[PDB]
Structure 1
């Protein structure tokens, strides 16, 4: 459980909700979009799949709560651009998600005290044109 030694910290956010900037535990760092299929590699301030005692638990989340790290739920975690995104992988600071056409990326979660925190960053999302056709929905059967 590599999460025994490792830990979590806090950062800053440009949009915690309603255009107000604050110190968010779900603060956005780097949003990688090198994948041609459309998968986004999101780097966050908190840690997913690890508990406060440094132990592996996929249903648990580790975030910073006023000087001390606290536990949260994996189900509470959400990613959205203009519509919700499907999460296809979570480990530590990294989240994998497939998002529709959007201009701002939003990443959030829900804590133990039932309070939701979300960080919004301006990001022009528009999966490149893989091929010669600019389609929106992906086909089950087509050209390889």
Structure 2
């Protein structure tokens, strides 16, 4: 019995959507298009939503080392290691699942999410986003105690 195998990803799919900057300021139909950046977390954690699906393969199976994106008409598999998040400098990715990414980012004015496909071709999406998280408490510190 596989009565506990509820997989919502069998019904859903990664997609191509508008991105204003796919690199060098030019717009494209991006397989890593930025949908929404959430910054309600006072600890500074960013909840990022993209057009692709992380941790899912084309056959709908769950694999944390894999990523699925829309390649022209059909979805294709890509490596999780190739996925990156950056503002003014690289971000620390804390969690990935489906359309969602958790990231700890340094101060910036833009937000970029990208990956490397099967053909070794890099794909990225840049959106203007002011990131300067407020101080937790009364001391501006760097590392977590």
TM over 0.5: yes
C-alpha distance in structure 1 between counterparts of 2:15 and 2:28, whole Å: 15
Instruction: Tell me the secondary structure at the aligned position of residue 9 of structure 2.
Output: helix
The 10-residue stretch of structure 1 (3-12 or 23-32) with the greater mean CA deviation from structure 2: 3-12
Deviations 1:88-122 (A, max 9, x none): 10000000000001110010000000000100000
1:136 Cα shift?
A: 4.6
Q: How far does the alpha carbon of each residue in 1:52-89 deviate from its partner, in whole angstroms, 9 at most, with x for none?
A: 11110110100001111111000000000011111110
User: 1:3 is paired with a residue of what secondary structure?
Assistant: helix
Aligned to 1:80: 86
- In the TM superposition, residue 7 of structure 1 has moved relative to its aligned partner by 1.5
Determine the C-alpha separation between the residues in 2 that align with 1:58 and 1:112. Answer: 17
The CA distance in 2 between the partners of 1:101 and 1:135, in whole Å, is 14
Match of 1:103 among 106, 109, 113: 109
Unaligned stretches of 5+ residues in structure 1? 140-144
Structure 2: unaligned runs, 5 residues or longer: 1-6
The farther-off stretch of 28-37 and 125-134 is 125-134
Q: 1-side partners of 2:8 and 2:55: how far apart?
A: 11
Give the secondary-structure state (helix, strand or coil) at the position aligned to 2:30.
Answer: coil
1:2 Cα shift? Answer: 3.4
Calculate the TM-score normalised by the size of structure 1. Answer: 0.91
Query: 1:29 is paired with a residue of what secondary structure?
Result: strand
CA separation in 2, counterparts of 1:126 and 1:65? 34
Q: 1:131 aligns with which of 118, 123, 137?
A: 137
**Partner SS for 1:64:** strand
